[PDB]
Amino acid sequence: MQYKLILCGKTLKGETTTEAVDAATAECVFKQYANDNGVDGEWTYDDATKTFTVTE
Amino acid sequence: MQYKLILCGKTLKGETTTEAVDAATAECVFKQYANDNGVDGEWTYDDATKTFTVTE
Numbered sequence: 001m002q003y004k005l006i007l008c009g010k011t012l013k014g015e016t017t018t019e020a021v022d023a024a025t026a027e028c029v030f031k032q033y034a035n036d037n038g039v040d041g042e043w044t045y046d047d048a049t050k051t052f053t054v055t056e
Numbered sequence: 057m058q059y060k061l062i063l064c065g066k067t068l069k070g071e072t073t074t075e076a077v078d079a080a081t082a083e084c085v086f087k088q089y090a091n092d093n094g095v096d097g098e099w100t101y102d103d104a105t106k107t108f109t110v111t112e
């Protein structure tokens with residue numbers, strides 16, 4: 001059988017902040033910013049640093 | 057409160073193939089190839105396409 005290996009890396013596209021009353025509201029704002037820009041992706045949220053990442 | 061959003065992308069750094077009796081052998085082979093090339097990362101496997109990915 002033939003098997004394939006893809007080697008992949010991660011790259012930084014961008015960084016932004018926003019003011020929101022809570023993390024849930026910030027997530028909806030950021031999902032809009034990232035997804036009206038058409039790119040559904042993988043989300044993380046770290047509450048200690050109030051930071052979301054999206055990998056799209 | 058201030059929230060941050062880091063936007064990430066994916067990069068294709070390489071691709072190889074190998075011939076093997078089964079997926080478990082292919083994985084060992086590919087891990088050797090990765091380790092020889094100082095590629096360290098997270099592994100996935102998609103049986104439908106017989107493709108491993110390693111993301112660094």
Ligand SMILES: *SCC1=CC(C)(C)N(O)C1(C)C
Nearest residue numbers: 006007008009066067068109
């Ligand atoms: S390069 C990362 C990657 C590999 C594959 C499984 C083909 N993918 O769908 C993505 C883009 C996640």
Ligand SMILES: *SCC1=CC(C)(C)N(O)C1(C)C
Nearest residue numbers: 010011012013062063064065
């Ligand atoms: S944006 C790609 C990326 C994700 C994370 C794991 C947060 N990183 O440290 C980098 C900047 C490599």
Ligand SMILES: *SCC1=CC(C)(C)N(O)C1(C)C
Nearest residue numbers: 080081082083084085087088
């Ligand atoms: S030999 C391929 C392999 C590597 C490691 C991650 C140590 N494994 O558990 C297997 C045997 C799948």
